[PDB]
Amino acid sequence: GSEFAALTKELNACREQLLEKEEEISELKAERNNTRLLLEHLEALVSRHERSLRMT
Amino acid sequence: SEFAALTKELNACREQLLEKEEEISELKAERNNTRLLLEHLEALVSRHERSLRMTVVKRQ
Amino acid sequence: SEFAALTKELNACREQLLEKEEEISELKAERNNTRLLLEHLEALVSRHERSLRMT
Amino acid sequence: PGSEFAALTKELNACREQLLEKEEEISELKAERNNTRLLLEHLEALVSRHERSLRMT
Secondary structure, three states: HHHHHHHHHOOOOHHHHHHHHHHHHHHHHHHHHHHHHHHHHHHHHHHHHHHOOOHH | OOOHEEEEEEEEHHHHHHHHHHHHHHHHHHHHHHHHHHHHHHHHHHHHHHHHHHHHHHHO | OOHHHHHHHHHHHHHHHHHHHHHHHHHHHHHHHHHHHHHHHHHHHHHHHHOOHHH | OHHHHHHHHHHHHHHHHHHHHHHHHHHHHHHHHHHHHHHHHHHHHHHHHHHHHOOOO
């Protein structure tokens, strides 16, 4: 019975670290979306101006 | 068989733990590739802006 | 008749000279608008690059 | 007559010299303009290629 408790304390500890890892993942995927959005604006800005210089 | 069921869940949780830290590793590596691009983009833009900034002073 | 020919070419030379000055003015205007974009591109890129630094 | 024609010729010649000078500055501006366009071509290619890569990993 005392071993079941110790085994539970380890699983719970592993569950805590799992969420800590996923919180790290979630923030990384968030940073990626910020990049994707930046790259969208950059591509739009350069293409718009490239066409202007090319077609005048 | 609660002990057995607990050990299996504990095992599966540790598998997902390695699984999640590998994704962190891949995202961090992917993040570094982004930084290298941004470094390069800032370089090309600043270098060209520099050429324009000097041309106005030179051609004057 | 030679004077008349010389004056016409002189007038035409000034007419084309005005066109070039107008072209230069447009080119320098377009150039300045280009620098504005570049400064904006550098600003956006440098900012997001600062967000993606390690610790 | 000969003095008048010569002086008018000098004026036309002066206009011609300034015309080619203006054309030289134009050709330089247009060259710089081509440099910028090429940069934007590489920038566009880079950001789009990287955008497509982030939409997979």
